Ligand binder design. Structure first.
Ligand code: HC1
Ligand code: SF4
Ligand code: SF4
Ligand code: SF4
Ligand code: SF4
Ligand code: FES
Length: 574
């Protein structure tokens, strides 16, 4: 037993944890900034977590272990003067103009400035902001006028992906963060997954904006603007409207999008059922052809970049089905004109994604046919939240509406796509029906669900056993390969997601305060919205989606053949 006194209050504890962890568990206030993902800024620690341990002096609570007989003061004058000084030094390298800033309503640094009444010794007012901003990437942007050099992005990149594509750099004698050799991130091994943005306390890292594309399209009278959101958006945008976590706001998003002036409200979960139509068909074909095995999913652009940059020999093993976003986009410029009379040229398709890598995918040169882009604009969950707020839409009090059904209906298989294992389960529900020409009632594949780094399961399909694997996060893909786990058995189908937890924890998602992250399992609570929708949907197999069956019946023909093979596919050769 340990006896520790914190602010004159006696505590007896069995545990071996840090002063910060103990404080956060016992309602004692200690501020923190550089500590995230169980690591602080080792080199150049922020010291916002300073507490006083009588006898030792000022220590950083985020990495100092509680000890028997320890007497801590978290709020003495010397502690507060030290913390206020460190925030003041950060204010000296921070362009403190919150009014137009994209983190204005949820900035961790603004909260610390208010809390300690910190003031810069000299206001940082850079005249030329172009020497601090890098907007060269199709997915990420850097604004160094806001960077605290707290290292949270560098640690999050290393942990979540193990690429270390985000680095500390010495530009002209001074420390900055950026890509290798200060290149555009797109030209390096970076996966453009945006986990560095998610880890940033301030507006120093952002998504590459597609808001002007959307604004101009809605204002162009001859353009018919389609919008379709990703699985994960309905499970998370409510967080930015003070609704809490795990709230299903699908119906509110549909109404908000109509109020924003979009001409047709569709859903990328329709595109998810399309990807399963093509990919489950392709899996049954590889089974019949005795290979090539394994087949990997090709729907995560972060993973496609990881395969192109680190494992190019695996590219021919990736599924030729386009991702839900791109397969939806292809059909929006071809099928959707045939059932509406719209000129293909006038259809402008916008998606809402939990992801920054999806902007890169949408802008890949060959993701078009006959000069028409599959996808014209991709805005993140955060960008749509700002669009709703700028338009003064009372999101939390909106009435529910439904999507327009032709490319808006989705099955429960499409609904779970945003969670790790979702694509795998959805694909198996169709591939087993397809391969043994039946309609099976047992459709839940709980063995591929959950937050484990690497998951596997043996599935019997048409009286033969097959091995599937789900790789949860880019660092776990590297582990799977480098450890030789890939060679313990013959894998036949492997799902790979670059973000830990799947797309519900994507790089374009709502930022979450580090205090709420320790209290709430964000990956499980966001994913639960999607599994609950599946549980309550009438159709739970992709091939039973009524709107999709008539789309293939009337326009595409059979999946994986003819017109479907001809335009709904994409294969990478580098
Ligand atoms: O971003 C992201 Fe995702 O694996 C999510 O949510 S799940 Fe997807 O196949 C695609 O495209 C689908 O459907 S990638 C998204 O929209
Ligand atoms: S990053 Fe935070 S403190 Fe800095 S200008 Fe933006 S809102 Fe204000
Ligand atoms: S986008 Fe992903 S891979 Fe690139 S620097 Fe950020 S965390 Fe690292
Ligand atoms: S970009 Fe953000 S997370 Fe990275 S060092 Fe700067 S303030 Fe910290
Ligand atoms: S896991 Fe989803 S959010 Fe993350 S990079 Fe892949 S597609 Fe984007
Ligand atoms: S939060 Fe402890 S040194 Fe930064």
């Amino acid at each position: 037993m340990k006896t520790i006194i914190i602010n004159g209050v006696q505590f007896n504890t069995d545990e071996d944890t840090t002063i910060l962890k103990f404080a956060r568990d016992n309602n004692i206030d200690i501020s923190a900034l550089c500590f995230l993902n169980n690591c602080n800024n080792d080199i150049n620690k922020c010291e916002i977590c300073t507490v006083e341990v009588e006898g030792t002096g000022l220590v950083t609570a985020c990495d100092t272990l509680i000890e028997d007989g320890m007497i801590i003061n978290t709020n003495s004058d010397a502690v507060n003067e030290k913390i206020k000084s460190r925030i003041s030094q950060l204010l000296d390298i921070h362009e403190f103009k919150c009014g137009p800033c994209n983190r204005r309503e949820n900035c961790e640094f603004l909260k610390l400035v208010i809390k300690y009444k910190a003031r810069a010794s000299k206001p940082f007012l850079p005249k030329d902001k172009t020497e601090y901003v890098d907007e060269r990437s199709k997915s990420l942007t850097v604004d160094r006028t806001k960077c605290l050099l707290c290292g949270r992005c560098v640690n999050a990149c290393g942990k979540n992906t193990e690429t270390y594509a985000m680095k500390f750099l010495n530009k002209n004698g001074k420390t900055i963060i950026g890509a290798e050799d200060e290149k555009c991130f797109d030209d390096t091994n970076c996966l453009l997954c945006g986990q560095c943005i998610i880890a940033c306390p301030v507006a120093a890292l952002s998504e590459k904006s597609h808001m002007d594309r959307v604004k101009n399209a809605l204002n162009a009278p001859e353009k018919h603007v389609i919008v379709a959101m990703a699985p994960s958006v309905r499970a998370s945008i409510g967080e930015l409207f003070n609704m809490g976590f795990g709230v299903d706001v699908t119906g509110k998003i549909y109404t908000a999008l109509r109020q924003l002036g979009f001409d047709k409200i569709f859903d990328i979960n329709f595109g998810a059922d399309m990807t399963i139509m093509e990919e489950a068909t392709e899996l049954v074909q590889r089974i019949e052809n005795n290979g090539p095995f394994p087949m990997f999913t090709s729907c995560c652009p972060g993973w496609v970049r990881q395969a192109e940059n680190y494992y190019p020999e695996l590219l021919n093993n990736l599924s030729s089905a386009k991702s839900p976003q791109q397969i939806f986009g292809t059909a929006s410029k071809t099928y959707y004109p045939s059932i509406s009379g719209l000129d293909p040229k006038n259809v402008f398709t916008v998606t809402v994604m939990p992801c920054t890598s999806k902007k890169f995918e949408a802008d890949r040169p060959q993701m078009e046919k006959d000069g028409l882009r599959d996808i014209d604009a991709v805005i993140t969950t955060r960008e749509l939240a700002k669009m709703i707020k700028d338009a003064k839409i009372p999101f939390a009090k909106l009435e529910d509406s439904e999507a327009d059904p032709a490319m808006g209906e989705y099955s429960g298989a499409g609904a779970i796509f945003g969670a790790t294992g979702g694509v795998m389960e959805a694909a198996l529900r169709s591939a087993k029906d397809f391969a043994e020409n039946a309609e099976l009632e047992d459709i839940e594949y709980k063995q591929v669900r959950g937050l484990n780094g690497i998951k596997e399961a043996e599935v019997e399909i048409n009286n033969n056993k097959y091995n599937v694997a789900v790789i949860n996060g880019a660092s776990n893909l590297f582990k799977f390969m480098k450890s030789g786990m890939i060679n313990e058995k013959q894998y036949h189908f492997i799902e790979v997601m670059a973000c830990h937890g799947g797309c519900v924890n994507g790089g374009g998602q709502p930022h979450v305060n580090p205090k709420d992250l320790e209290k709430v399992d964000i990956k499980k609570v966001r994913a639960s919205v999607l599994y609950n929708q599946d549980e309550h949907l009438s159709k739970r197999k992709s091939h039973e989606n009524t709107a999709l069956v008539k789309m293939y019946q009337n326009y595409f023909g059979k999946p994986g053949e003819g017109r479907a093979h001809e335009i709904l596919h994409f294969k990478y050769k580098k």
